[model samples]
Target: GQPPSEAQVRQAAWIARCVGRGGSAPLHRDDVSALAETLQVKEFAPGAVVFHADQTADGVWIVRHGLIELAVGSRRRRAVVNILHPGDVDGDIPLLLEMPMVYTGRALTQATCLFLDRQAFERLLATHPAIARRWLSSVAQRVSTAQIRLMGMLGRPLPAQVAQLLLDEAIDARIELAQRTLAAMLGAQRPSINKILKEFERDRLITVGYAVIEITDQHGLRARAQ
Candidate 1:
């Protein structure tokens, strides 16, 4: 086969940059360069299922751009577990354990990813080593966050859930999430979540814009979360 193209290597370079900026993996700048050729550049359209639950994982995917959603349950009853952004890695656990994926990965937007097969991934872990540390920490964080969030969903009040989500995901007091995504994250209907958002807005806790939600009162929101 031919070598990787300039664009593909650029994508790999971006991953290295992400690492440099403390995004997910702890790989050094040069470490990712060695993986350029070994990585497969793939794209998925919005709403595409990147991988399905119960299916075998042949490799791991590193998100290069766009959002990826991890969900569980059947099609009609799926609940969002987490969302992956650029530099996020997926499928590593299933690939390393040689087990089927527990959750389905779907593209929330047009997404591009760099993929590495099981053999390559293992080889990198053996050679790079630091990546293993980063991966382990990332995995631990995901597990803990998922455990806590799932527990919250079990009995947490709707306002509390929404408040917590905003506090967790907001950047500079703003969150770029849709009402539908918010509903799925909380395992509630969109109309119900919308009504809650209206309440938050009315109480001056937040401001709901066209495509973004702004946290206007952090103190009040935190109180609501409790």
Candidate 2:
């Protein structure tokens, strides 16, 4: 109806980039404009629930800004499944399958998202074969990413695992979450995590305090992670 704002234009650019991956041709400028016009903007505050596993899939959401945490399992046994960044699409698989969400998504920080109606998204895929192929490739990549994380979580040493966790969750070299949460994420015992964390502090790799871990030597920490 009206011209899109600069922010909306940028979000559309991200969509084109995602859909253009895996050898798909770039979207035409007009295509991007059309897509932007159709997007519904949504905002989420920190700790807000974006979707639940039991909720019926509504549509797809493109992360425009801020972090989203995708978690799985029941209340007593939940674990962090993945963290979504800007440019990532959420709920596409469930929407396509016509099923409930597989995981719960929560905004870990204030988040901005662009929502695409399920029917409109499906129509786009039908109109643009390349877009459908690229979207399928993107889903495969998500599976590979998850597998890699699982391998690392299972095979890496405790120090390395903790290092990676810190690297993944850190904002400005600091992770401001509690130790118990970290333990749950890694599926490790709290005392075990405490011991490794103490070793990290002794080695000058990090500093830990009330509800926070500040990485002091990113170079060393990354080396351990690898």
Candidate 3:
């Protein structure tokens, strides 16, 4: 790989700094510079593949911006395992374990990523012990988040799950949302999401104006979320 330009180097440093913070470590200037030297930037449009399953684990990738969905199976019968956001790193487990990639990583939106090949990544970790510690911390955090999501799904009824989705949107200050988008995010069939919305409307918990969902009963919805 060629050396990154000054601007790219700066961007790489910023990303490393953020990842370090997420992992509860402080990344130094030299460490960031070293990362920049070995990093390759790639951009992807929505639904584009970052890497496919069973591919050689060339390196781990850090999401510099946008979202990526990690999933299994083909288009018709896929199960989303996780939604990765900016500052999140993926493809590390395979690299660390010296195994092939287990899941397909697809861009959920326009995304920018930094790739570090195996040797460069191992070298970086060797030179910066904090980076390794931070990476482990990040992996732990992702596991905890996944566990929480699983617990929520197991504990909540379907109605409550739908209600929680609405509540989450409202909490994010999103008063207008497309039902189809919500259905995809929640990993439910469109009809299922629509049925729940209709039920909420009949109960006077919400008002659906075309594609927009307006929360009429915030208190009731909040209770449902819990």
Candidate 4:
């Protein structure tokens, strides 16, 4: 793995600023230079494992480019917990807590990441108190988002769940999400998700075209979800 190029370093610093917010110490020029000193860049080929469930978190990673799918379990029982896009930080929870990682981080595409080993991270935190606090805040926000997502899954009906998922992918509202993937996320069966989607299509709330599903009636879908 090569260390981040000058341009990549700037990109990562920008991401840190966005995630940490300018109110918290933005990743200044000095910070980026310092980070480059201790950071190790790793390139993951698509489908490769960056880290696995229960593995010791040797380092924390900041995505520089491409997507990573966080999953748990082996092939047969694996489930996608979340997708980490560029600018998102992953593999930090376990490192911060000194626990084994709960999910596996796998590259969804060729991806680059900045890795800070535990020792380097400790040193960085000691030297940069603001960055440490900002990182902690980012972690807290992620926890809150996860909690809300879980609540939605547990409390919402099938239509609502589907609607929410579609809304999450607003840019591709008509995109065809794999039925199995949707079922796994909602703690339901493929048949059940398929059934609900089919019914919604029949009711003119949505239009099913091949693998694509267009939300024809946003209001109606939201009403059902509510």
Best by lDDT: 1
Q: Residue 108 error for model 4, in Å? A: 3.0
**TM-score, structure 4 vs. true:** 0.70
Native-to-model Cα distance after best TM-score fit, residue 77 in candidate 1, in Å? 14
The TM-score between candidate 3 and the true structure equals 0.59
Worst 10-residue stretch by lDDT in candidate 1? 12-21
Per-residue error (Å), model 4, residue 139: 1.8
* lDDT tens digits, residue span 8-96, model 1: 32232222211212344534435556679898888999988888866888888777789887665555545454567777676775565
Would you list the rank order by TM-score, best first? 4, 2, 1, 3
List the global CA lDDT of all models.
Answer: 0.70, 0.69, 0.65, 0.64
CA shift of 74, model 2, Å:
12
lDDT by residue (tens digit), candidate 4, 1-226: 2322333322222222223222332244355556885788889999988877667878777777788776554654454445666656655666776766666778999998778788987888888789877766766765565556667667667778877766654444564434555565565666888888899888888876654568888788777777
TM-score of structure candidate 1: 0.64
User: lDDT (0-100) at residue 57 of candidate 3?
Assistant: 82
How far off is residue 73 in model 1, in Å?
12
| Clash list (residue pairs), candidate 4 | none
Each candidate's number of clashing pairs is 0, 0, 0, 0
Candidate 2 Cα RMSD (Å): 10.4
Pick by lDDT: 1 or 3, better one: 1
Candidate 1: list runs displaced more than 4 Å. 1-23, 26-29, 42-55, 65-84, 97-112, 126-128, 152-155, 189-191, 209-212
Between prediction 1 and prediction 4, which has the larger lDDT?
A: 1
